[PDB]
Amino acid sequence: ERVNVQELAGHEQSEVAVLRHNLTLRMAHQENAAWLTCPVTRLVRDAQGQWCRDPRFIPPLLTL
Amino acid sequence: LAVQHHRIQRFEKGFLLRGLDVEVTLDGNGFAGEGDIHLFGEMLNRFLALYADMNQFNQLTLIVQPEGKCIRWKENHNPRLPG
């Protein structure tokens, strides 16, 4: 990735190449050749065809 | 009287591309009716007749007398074709 970076003693910015990770959102029942090991949500639908995030989901936690 | 300058530019992919800087001055008044109209319509002409080498990033900086503004002109010039 290439963006603009400046912090130095001075007021000029230039462009340097930085490193960014690659994420995607797969599902639970597909495969495990990628990584997951972490849920983030759980989707249940309404009877009107409306997916909603259920309020009783709990991820594995680092903080409250 | 026109002044010759030159400059060094960084590219997107991290390379230096040589350029120049032309600096012309109007100084003196009554160019034409609307300099906002004419000197815009003038620099679209005088820039296009300024292709002068093969590895020269383009250079037009129009300076009307210190009466509020100086007009720059540059384009996205790339290693395929000048813009």
UniProtKB/TrEMBL annotation, chain A:
Domain of life: Bacteria
Protein name: Type VI secretion system baseplate subunit TssK
UniProt organism field: Escherichia coli (strain 55989 / EAEC)
Lineage: Bacteria, Pseudomonadati, Pseudomonadota, Gammaproteobacteria, Enterobacterales
UniProtKB/TrEMBL annotation, chain B:
Name by which UniProt lists this protein: Type VI secretion system baseplate subunit TssF
Residue span relative to the full protein: 505 to 587 of 587
